[PDB]
């Protein structure tokens, strides 16, 4: 079967197996689960490690007395269950104060206390081990034009993350950020919408090696965009720090499925990819257990997420391992594509009579692809009617 | 009235008004138009200058001296008409050679081949006074999975750009290079998908300099995305080289109607953004006249491209200009948004009580946005109902 | 200026300026409203009447006492400002017991105490004087496939309207129903998605002369349909019983912004169509003040509302009104469009040989539709560069 | 293995084996097929029967003498083979003349020519055994607001069809109609845009009975739709006379995939309906072999649609037939879906007090829907990690 180890870097934040599930048209229809609970009950289920939100961690507003008592019990059940804090992020989003941002909120005010209230959790973070910390801008937006100078309000958002970066060195920090993209939601439209803007705007900052990319599944395919080649640009350009995993059933509403739920090739592809192209980091769950579920579904749900890894994580294997599809791949050229385009140089390139005096086009674009034969295998494999 | 002037700076590609209407589903229902003839037409109704796709000009696979036939003709009109020729691109999508893409096809000959294809005609666009040379991938990507490794492919892209920034300087040559995103069509999935992705890869290049890019409204917006904030971003990273301006009424083929049809209040946000930024390079219309009309329909849409642009323009400007506004955009804290967030510092801020300790986020989420009052006297502006 | 007064039929839900602010990611920005004070607050503003939830006027779970006391209140603000009900709709969305719906609930004690607590407030809703009574199946559907069998829920839904339709026939109220259709959020897949959707579904019922639709803008739009083809529709069938409108920006989350906002063209056409088509009933608007916004913006807001309306009712007007256009309009044939194709019957048109063995395609296919100066003008009339 | 014969329905159109991969940005990768060679190759296949288009089978234009050859020819295939024709179609999209549409174009004599070429194509359908005729109005619909009037528009599409169906009584045939709906490409929105709205209007002909629908998968999901739950609601309206099967990658261009590819999860659900709802009509595969294939690779994409379906099928029985699945399905109530909500009638529900004055909500409400763990027991299945 597929169990899950520690050794699986499967984790998950606080706010997924404890989401009460409440939305814009709906009241909670599960209680507060505590965070000790559930770093014993992930633990119980193979999970690797938790992450969390300042305020999912201490009550917003909490006195400094109640603080230190949310962070002993918390730290009392990792410690008796080995349970890792990977990652750990800053909710600037639920009080009403980040109603237009916090970074980029147009109060100067706001934008000082959001500094603030991040800079406190990220000493904690790095207390508990966290090696990443994630922002998720979802306040930083707009929802009509003029609201908001986009130009000027990345200025605002350059100077947030200089300013956190400059904090991290200063202190001596072995930590780093990843900005995690959302095309829209809860604003009509959010800053850095896409893995690519995130990556651009990256190379922006003052000390580019300190940031990443925390995408997430479901946010890229809320813009219709293809999930793996993402990340695959995150991979070449050495940016993927830390990834979120779920499912999403096309463009609508942030759904947070569990993984493997919603594009299901896409999941497919997904894991072909970071297992083949090493990555080493957490293999995060950022997925909301629906609301039509009670505690039993819940955890019913979060086993459902590590699962589902697996058994693609298995089929991704048996799929290239198969001879049939190494043959079926040398076929579509796979291999050819890997072959410098010019090795020779741009002169003899230009001297190349075979490149364009002699060329045949006609004569080339009769080759067949042979790309549906190698999908074929490729479906083959994941529906298991092949290894 | 809003008459155009060469001084607009209003272009348009042969491939615009020349579009014979064959679609997916149906047959031409133009008859062809000669280059030489769009000249005088699109001069006569106030453009400053045309663009070209190498194949537009020439037919493919035409000899040597029919070429120099073709360029001398297209020559004339230029000169009788004093037209500029601001942009040129390459067709690396319509022959069938071009099936699986050109810089990245995994045919190494097919690569090599689209390379020499292109160097030929940046030669010629030198040679007619272009300062801009536009590169839209089309045939960048795939349908399934395992037909394309994105990291190599990548690899294959940025060669191929490298190896033309490498040409470009050796021949001295004052140009520079815009990467047209895309999300999708003819391919599955485009490499390169939006502004974000294509200003990322840039800066890998060897010589990001040399590239910037040349946004389309309807691309954009073929991934739901806000087209004005993806132009912000790309001016605020000083690589908004040139654009493509049309209209798309939402999330479905790329329809490429006349500007100011489809997203009308985006493109209101559009130019009030350039001119307020002060883009200084071409309003160039990638469009196409709706097959259902005839060439007495081509001109009336390609005239309808710039009267928009030009009763727009002056609605932002009278928006920008009223007092209401200006009052209105201070209640809304515009003027803050421009104030430093920590002018005094890191440490200043870290020592700052009203930031945090003596905080009041209750009191300051008390504040009104008054970001309807804001949008609707936009509104307002842009019905006329008002200045 | 635009001037609302209560022959306008602007109509407001009280959910909706009394929307606090809370979002799936946050809390609310806006101190609750009393239901008096919005009556009051809107027919000073010009409003013709008032909509409503039974939960929003009568809080969930309150005894028969401070039920009554709650409408007398409710009772006295509509009396003194002479405000109308025209509508009223009950909550089957919120209480977490709605979970999995309410007339579609897998629990048939769930769906029971669904009708009895519709029933009731139906009562109420006559008793004011609502003559349309609407079911939005916010909670009807499902997340993954197996936890619907739509088939056997489409005949609980078909039970569940031909019960009320009974009841409502039984008691002789002369009230209508109106089902308000939605394609996701917060489920998965809603079922009765579309305007399409719910008019099929209604000709099943056993009356369906009493049931028709109340289409929201936004909704469709949510699917990226064109909403006045689906108004026509609805309208063609006689079955455009009410109306929401508000805006939306593509496809995501239901936005519910202020009408005018989003799709500004659509608003055009769609009040074009509704006041040349006579439509005569209330213009309702399910908007939701943004939660940037304090108390003043939403009034702002809301007046937004109709002064939009009002706007856009006069440009329409001028449109139709202008000779250049009824001329446009025969130039495009759409003249011919109301000519029957063969009034002549089959016979005669089998026998006529100028429709198909004498007839010259290419020559009609010549034919331009001169569709685009009848749009550019419709562009110029919209931004008063013309009537 | 899975092994695809006549028994299992699968038919194929001339246009999609045959479709020679010219797009709007490309020209054909592959030559002209002979029908008849098309019917023998997919005989060959396994393959139950094909369709046709008129024009498909007949060149536009081509006189009596070759049109009476083309179908000979055509007709010894089919003898030779037993390949069955259960389904026709026109083609009312491809000539310019139908550039506005067929049934709904302003101009009169366009409209009477497409009926004529309608009625031509229906008589040779039911001389080669179809049952079913097939309407797609892809040239239905608008680009621009007042380009057509839609209620009128709705009325000349009810007369074309009303015509049809006269026509086809007054001959005694023994064939439906089946309208295929698309909500937009080529046109900008297409009329009767999903399976909801062809429903509604079937509904308004005058002989309904002759009238269902023939979807989509990739259409319903161009508009974000659930295609099982469409299926479901015309399957429950007995209206499902026919369907077309491939794969959609989301909102886009209409891709027309191998049946399978795009929405896997969704393939699954559709067979596990058409299975279980014992759906006894063609299993028709309206896709198109990506242009980045040769011959080889267009009959190795022919195979993998029937495969595909048939490991599907296999999967879904499977999951039914699991006793785990069904206890599972108890425990999600889906048998209590079953159950009338009230039985007993409107009176007894009326004066029940355990369906409202005694039911406590908040018990019921803490009911878990267990609809997580069936979920995940479904992914197992289709991953054949177990049955
Ligand atoms: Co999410
Ligand atoms: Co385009
Ligand atoms: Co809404
Ligand atoms: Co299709
Ligand atoms: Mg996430
Ligand atoms: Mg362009
Ligand atoms: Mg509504
Ligand atoms: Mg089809």
């Given at each position: 079967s597929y169990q899950p180890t520690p050794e699986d870097k499967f984790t998950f934040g606080l706010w997924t197996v404890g989401w009460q599930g409440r939305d814009p048209?709906?009241?909670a229809t599960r209680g507060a689960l505590d965070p000790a609970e559930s770093v014993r009950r992930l633990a119980e289920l193979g999970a690797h490690g938790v992450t969390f939100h300042d305020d999912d961690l201490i009550p917003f507003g909490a006195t400094d007395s109640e603080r230190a008592e949310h962070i002993?019990?918390?730290?009392?059940?990792?410690?008796?269950?080995?349970?890792?804090?990977?990652?750990?992020?800053?909710?600037?989003?639920?009080?009403?104060?980040?109603?237009?941002?916090?970074?980029?909120?147009?109060?100067?005010?706001?934008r000082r206390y959001a500094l603030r209230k991040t800079i406190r959790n990220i000493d904690l973070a790095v207390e508990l081990g966290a090696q990443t910390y994630v922002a998720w801008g979802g306040r930083?937006?707009?929802?009509?034009?003029?609201?908001?100078?986009?130009?000027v309000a990345l200025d605002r958002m350059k100077e947030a993350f200089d300013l956190l970066?400059?904090?991290?060195?200063?202190?001596?920090?072995?930590?780093?950020?990843?900005?995690?993209?959302?095309?829209?939601?809860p604003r009509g439209d959010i800053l850095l919408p896409t893995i690519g803007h995130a990556l651009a705007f990256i190379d922006g900052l003052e000390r580019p090696e300190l940031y990443?990319?925390?995408?997430?599944?479901?946010?890229?395919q809320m813009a219709g965009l293809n999930?793996?080649?993402?990340?695959?640009?995150?991979?070449?350009?050495?940016?993927?720090?830390?990834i979120d995993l779920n499912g999403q059933s096309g463009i609508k509403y942030d759904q947070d499925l569990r993984f493997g739920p919603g594009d299901?090739?896409?999941?497919?592809?997904?894991?072909?990819?970071?297992?083949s192209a090493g990555y080493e980091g957490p293999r995060h769950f950022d997925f909301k257990p629906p609301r039509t579920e009670d505690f039993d579904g819940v955890w019913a749900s979060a086993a459902g997420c590590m699962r589902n890894y697996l058994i693609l994580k298995e089929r991704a294997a048996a799929f290239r391992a198969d001879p049939e599809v190494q043959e079926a791949l040398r076929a579509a050229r796979l291999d050819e594509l890997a072959q410098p385009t010019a090795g020779d140089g741009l002169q003899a390139l230009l001297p190349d009579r075979s490149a364009?005096?002699?060329?045949?086009?006609?004569?080339?674009?009769?080759?067949?692809?042979?790309?549906?034969?190698?999908?074929?295998?490729?479906?083959?494999?994941?529906?298991?009617?092949?290894?």
């Open positions: 048209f709906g009241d002993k019990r918390f730290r009392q059940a990792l410690d008796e269950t080995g349970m890792k804090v990977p990652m750990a992020t800053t909710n600037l989003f639920t009080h009403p104060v980040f109603k237009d941002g916090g970074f980029t909120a147009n109060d100067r005010d706001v930083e937006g707009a929802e009509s034009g003029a609201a908001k100078d986009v130009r970066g400059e904090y991290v060195t200063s202190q001596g920090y072995d930590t780093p950020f990843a900005i995690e993209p959302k095309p829209n939601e990443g990319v925390n995408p997430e599944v479901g946010h890229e999930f793996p080649h993402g990340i695959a640009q995150a991979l070449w350009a050495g940016k993927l720090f830390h299901l090739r896409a999941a497919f592809w997904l894991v072909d990819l970071l297992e364009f005096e002699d060329f045949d086009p006609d004569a080339a674009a009769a080759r067949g692809m042979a790309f549906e034969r190698l999908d074929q295998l490729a479906m083959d494999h994941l529906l298991g009617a092949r290894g």
